[PDB]
Amino acid sequence: TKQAPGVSIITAEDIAKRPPSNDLSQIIRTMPGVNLTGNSSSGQRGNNRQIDIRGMGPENTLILVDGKPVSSRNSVRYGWRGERDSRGDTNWVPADQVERIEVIRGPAAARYGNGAAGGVVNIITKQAGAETHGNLSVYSNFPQHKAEGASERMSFGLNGPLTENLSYRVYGNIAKTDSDDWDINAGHESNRTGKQAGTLPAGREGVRNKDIDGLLSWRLTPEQTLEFEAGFSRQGNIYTGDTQNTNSNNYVKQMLGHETNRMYRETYSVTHRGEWDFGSSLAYLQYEKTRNSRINEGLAGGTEGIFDPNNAGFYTATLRDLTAHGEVNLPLHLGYEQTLTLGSEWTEQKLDDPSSNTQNTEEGGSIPGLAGKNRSSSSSARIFSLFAEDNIELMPGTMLTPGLRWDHHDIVGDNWSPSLNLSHALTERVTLKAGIARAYKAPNLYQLNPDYLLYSRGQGCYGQSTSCYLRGNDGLKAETSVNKELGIEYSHDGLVAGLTYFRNDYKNKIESGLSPVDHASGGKGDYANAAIYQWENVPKAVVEGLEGTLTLPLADGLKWSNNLTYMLQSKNKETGDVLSVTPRYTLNSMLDWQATDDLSLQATVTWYGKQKPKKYDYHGDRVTGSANDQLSPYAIAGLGGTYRLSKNLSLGAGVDNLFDKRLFRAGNAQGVVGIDGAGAATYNEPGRTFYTSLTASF
Ligand SMILES: [Fe+3]
């Protein structure tokens, strides 16, 4: 089945039948335990939502492609409020070239090591066969309201042998998602007075995609395969006014409709796969080079994450990410039928950022230890990792799975991530599952680099109105989480019913500090001698909720599926504020009618529960007025079909958001001077949208 406790598979069939516009996030997010959320309560860049597992935030969601980590978003400046001006890392593989997606949440994901505290999404691509196969895929959508960005997507796939032991697979994609009109939020905006009069919170960023992958699979022996692949992707945005704080200047307006960031993402990977009597071997080298070219932005206060007119033009941040992976697997007939997996891992992140480390100390006074001018462009970290997993069978149907992961981070120090997963046949129809693991987060190179410096005159300073600096902290402890999960599932003859409880106890979540640890010396006027805060480790936080699935076969022809998220708690236990803002619940329902041999018809509904904004502002003070505004529960319905003309040719068509339920980004969550808060109204919900699709394949 497509749901067990902790885990979800999305198939190619699934992707086919509920096509995403462009980014996979759209379909990935319908899994139990998954939200589409920011990393923080700020609401900053809040139309740039990413995949969240169990309310742990997107930085704790590890994206793999064919088991190889995607780190590209680490090339984007990590801001005061724990957001990046990033669209996330799910738009690198084109929808129609995906074989399947694995979503692994909580204690079952901790093994994957660094940044699987939320969970792991593994995007798996279609591979070459025995014969040569190919495909050509087209999708085009059509919003009812012209404001809203339409999407167009053309991908090709082409696979097979060339020798009896050589195979290849290639794909290409071209896609475009029109940005929402600059003014789509007009009249829904938060109340904006004085200087900040006129200003608009922005709709969805557009994106242009170009993805090209090649693989060779070289099988030199019966029991030896060697794979080479290179990947080339490019995303360039279409700007529609977005800024950290929703303020404007002239440069902003100049760029409306223009490309203001481009990511180039290049991957080369060597993968050797081994299978003999004693068991199975797998090891790879990936080199990921991300170039993040974007218009220079301010780093101070309300100037944080707006285009800086003083210093106009592009800079380029460079991420070199190097990953090497080894495992063997050993069956052991030891009384207990069991299987044993041994592994090393090595990673290096090199970050060059020419712009992030260029906040100066003129207005706030200088900081002992930190040069005010031409501070290093370099951060790096290496993690070395050992692990073993034992997959024990105690008695046919029971499985006990203990594992130890050990990580050496070359700055933060040693981590021990132990794990244990039980699954238990209570009946041939019922399985009880329980898991407790300590998952791992290495601080990001922004949080960790004491040359990385943000400044506020006071509007963004915790526990005061005076000027303050926020500084990187190479002393930081890693984030750990003890993810508990207890679940039950009935599964028999396409009747599936499951309910999981999850609680993640969240130690040393890394966040902008609350207390000053120093005061700067000198500078200008009332701003002189600013406070120094660091990135610190909040001692305790908790998330808590429920995952449900129910699948009823109404007839042979007819399948009713449901996935449930219910978010019980999300508490920073220090401040008492929320971690993420997610909907109180999420119910997805598909009806799948196999209405003929050839035709198949789909109805969908999503219910989103209430959404509540953060309680406290940047000061730690209780928010007031429209900063408290919540989002009411609402639903989104869809009808679609796939009508299959032949073995060679299939067509799709349907409607997202049948009833044109629309929402509009009013701004960020809290008030600043001149810009009333928007509470939970931080994102744009798209309206009615027709779509059509075409797949030719052999
Ligand atoms: Fe300010």
Side-chain angles (χ1 to χ4, degrees):
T1 78
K2 282 177 190 149
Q3 322 292 326
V7 176
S8 320
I9 318 304
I10 301 137
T11 63
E13 182 152 301
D14 283 355
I15 299 181
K17 266 201 217 127
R18 190 215 237 106
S21 284
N22 187 356
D23 185 336
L24 283 195
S25 71
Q26 190 175 337
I27 179 152
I28 291 156
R29 80 170 270 190
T30 75
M31 292 314 90
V34 181
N35 307 289
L36 196 75
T37 202
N39 199 70
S40 205
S41 44
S42 39
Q44 298 181 338
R45 316 283 200 192
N47 266 321
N48 274 20
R49 304 183 287 170
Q50 303 172 21
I51 291 302
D52 157 304
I53 303 178
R54 302 180 157 176
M56 289 289 293
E59 292 273 333
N60 269 323
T61 299
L62 164 54
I63 310 310
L64 307 181
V65 186
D66 301 311
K68 301 142 165 74
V70 182
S71 315
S72 286
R73 65 197 194 265
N74 293 258
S75 62
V76 183
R77 188 181 64 81
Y78 192 81
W80 201 312
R81 313 296 153 187
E83 298 287 343
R84 297 182 203 253
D85 188 358
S86 184
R87 298 174 310 270
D89 285 335
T90 40
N91 200 215
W92 286 127
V93 177
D96 297 302
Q97 300 300 327
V98 164
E99 172 71 38
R100 91 182 174 276
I101 319 187
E102 297 184 331
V103 188
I104 317 191
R105 316 185 286 284
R111 38 163 313 142
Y112 278 90
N114 156 35
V120 174
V121 179
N122 186 13
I123 288 143
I124 290 137
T125 62
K126 310 189 197 183
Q127 299 307 133
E131 262 161 3
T132 75
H133 307 265
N135 81 91
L136 159 60
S137 289
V138 165
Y139 162 105
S140 215
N141 75 19
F142 305 102
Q144 176 108 338
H145 306 259
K146 308 289 172 72
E148 283 162 22
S151 316
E152 303 142 290
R153 197 157 46 73
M154 194 168 322
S155 56
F156 88 82
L158 197 43
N159 41 99
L162 282 166
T163 79
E164 283 142 330
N165 29 319
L166 192 72
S167 308
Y168 66 86
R169 182 269 285 173
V170 310
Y171 63 84
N173 181 76
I174 308 96
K176 163 187 220 186
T177 322
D178 204 351
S179 102
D180 293 20
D181 289 6
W182 64 295
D183 62 355
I184 175 158
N185 286 338
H188 307 278
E189 83 263 3
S190 71
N191 168 51
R192 282 145 195 272
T193 69
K195 290 154 201 206
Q196 298 331 107
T199 69
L200 284 193
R204 295 172 305 182
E205 191 150 69
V207 56
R208 291 181 160 105
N209 305 78
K210 293 156 97 187
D211 321 303
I212 275 174
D213 194 84
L215 182 135
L216 280 197
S217 300
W218 201 340
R219 67 185 309 94
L220 298 63
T221 87
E223 64 207 345
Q224 198 155 5
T225 289
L226 192 82
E227 325 203 315
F228 322 82
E229 84 176 272
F232 205 154
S233 294
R234 164 193 166 82
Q235 297 172 347
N237 75 294
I238 306 166
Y239 191 57
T240 180
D242 182 32
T243 75
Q244 191 185 267
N245 301 97
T246 74
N247 49 341
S248 202
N249 61 61
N250 290 10
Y251 202 178
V252 170
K253 275 207 191 52
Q254 198 181 52
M255 289 322 277
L256 285 191
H258 278 192
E259 168 153 312
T260 71
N261 75 57
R262 24 187 183 285
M263 320 272 314
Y264 304 85
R265 171 175 203 274
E266 302 171 29
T267 45
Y268 317 92
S269 87
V270 164
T271 308
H272 163 297
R273 199 179 277 92
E275 294 222 17
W276 41 80
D277 303 14
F278 220 59
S280 156
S281 93
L282 171 50
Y284 64 71
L285 195 72
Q286 167 150 113
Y287 175 75
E288 156 187 277
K289 196 204 174 184
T290 315
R291 275 168 316 194
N292 167 23
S293 281
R294 79 184 40 220
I295 281 164
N296 297 259
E297 288 178 341
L299 296 165
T303 72
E304 188 188 357
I306 189 142
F307 299 155
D308 186 339
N310 279 307
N311 172 332
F314 297 80
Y315 73 95
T316 303
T318 294
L319 193 74
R320 294 164 153 81
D321 192 288
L322 203 45
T323 315
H325 185 90
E327 48 185 291
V328 303
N329 309 278
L330 309 157
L332 297 145
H333 319 283
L334 179 58
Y336 295 117
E337 207 86 322
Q338 66 198 190
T339 320
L340 184 40
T341 299
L342 306 200
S344 98
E345 216 194 82
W346 195 83
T347 62
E348 165 188 75
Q349 270 194 351
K350 275 201 276 178
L351 178 48
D352 197 318
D353 204 328
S355 156
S356 281
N357 293 14
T358 76
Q359 187 48 267
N360 87 6
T361 40
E362 289 207 71
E363 159 166 301
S366 79
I367 290 162
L370 186 144
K373 291 170 194 187
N374 308 138
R375 298 202 297 293
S376 167
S377 337
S378 290
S379 315
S380 60
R382 278 136 298 269
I383 304 105
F384 187 53
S385 285
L386 279 159
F387 60 94
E389 325 263 320
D390 200 20
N391 168 39
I392 301 166
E393 163 205 295
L394 290 84
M395 61 201 91
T398 310
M399 298 287 146
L400 197 35
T401 314
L404 182 54
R405 203 194 170 92
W406 163 85
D407 316 283
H408 183 90
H409 194 289
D410 77 1
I411 300 153
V412 163
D414 278 320
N415 204 67
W416 303 96
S417 304
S419 68
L420 179 63
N421 281 356
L422 156 65
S423 65
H424 195 13
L426 297 168
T427 313
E428 288 98 343
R429 307 211 215 178
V430 161
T431 306
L432 160 158
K433 299 224 162 85
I436 202 168
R438 180 193 212 96
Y440 181 38
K441 186 39 145 64
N444 69 42
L445 292 205
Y446 291 85
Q447 300 171 319
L448 201 82
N449 166 227
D451 304 294
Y452 180 51
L453 184 60
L454 306 165
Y455 168 76
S456 169
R457 308 192 149 110
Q459 180 117 247
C461 301
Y462 193 90
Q464 66 171 56
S465 304
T466 318
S467 42
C468 67
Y469 293 113
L470 176 64
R471 190 161 166 212
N473 183 9
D474 66 307
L476 276 173
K477 299 187 277 173
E479 318 179 350
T480 76
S481 176
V482 177
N483 315 322
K484 323 190 204 174
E485 94 186 330
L486 177 39
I488 198 169
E489 188 168 74
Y490 174 98
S491 192
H492 188 65
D493 306 340
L495 207 308
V496 178
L499 179 75
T500 320
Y501 171 82
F502 66 78
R503 177 194 183 84
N504 301 353
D505 295 284
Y506 200 181
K507 311 210 170 225
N508 297 1
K509 193 205 176 75
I510 294 167
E511 216 143 292
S512 80
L514 314 169
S515 262
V517 288
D518 242 351
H519 282 103
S521 68
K524 308 182 154 147
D526 316 305
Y527 304 149
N529 299 27
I532 303 193
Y533 303 80
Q534 339 179 296
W535 297 88
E536 283 178 13
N537 297 96
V538 163
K540 285 187 167 180
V542 51
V543 308
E544 206 190 1
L546 286 168
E547 300 172 339
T549 199
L550 175 74
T551 284
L552 306 176
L554 312 200
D556 292 46
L558 188 48
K559 174 158 267 210
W560 187 30
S561 319
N562 305 288
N563 306 296
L564 182 51
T565 312
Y566 197 86
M567 302 299 318
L568 296 173
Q569 209 177 10
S570 172
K571 213 169 163 142
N572 175 354
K573 254 221 183 192
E574 193 166 47
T575 54
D577 222 325
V578 292
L579 290 186
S580 260
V581 161
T582 64
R584 179 71 83 213
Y585 66 81
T586 321
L587 178 52
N588 309 266
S589 297
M590 201 174 246
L591 206 56
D592 214 318
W593 178 24
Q594 189 66 69
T596 80
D597 283 322
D598 312 299
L599 183 69
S600 92
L601 269 183
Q602 292 76 242
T604 70
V605 186
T606 295
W607 286 261
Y608 301 109
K610 196 169 284 180
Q611 305 171 63
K612 299 180 174 196
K614 76 180 176 153
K615 294 184 192 298
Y616 302 118
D617 68 340
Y618 304 149
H619 287 312
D621 298 1
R622 196 90 190 59
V623 297
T624 54
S626 47
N628 289 284
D629 288 7
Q630 315 171 132
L631 282 186
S632 273
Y634 67 96
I636 311 288
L639 290 178
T642 57
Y643 181 48
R644 147 166 172 158
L645 263 64
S646 72
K647 293 185 162 81
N648 310 338
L649 207 36
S650 330
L651 313 163
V655 187
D656 301 329
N657 186 3
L658 201 53
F659 307 129
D660 199 65
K661 187 38 152 152
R662 318 186 48 218
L663 275 69
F664 296 96
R665 175 190 167 68
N668 296 330
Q670 71 141 68
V672 290
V673 177
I675 308 165
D676 255 32
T682 64
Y683 66 85
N684 269 83
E685 193 65 46
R688 189 185 291 111
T689 323
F690 309 74
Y691 76 76
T692 42
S693 87
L694 163 72
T695 313
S697 65
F698 58 73

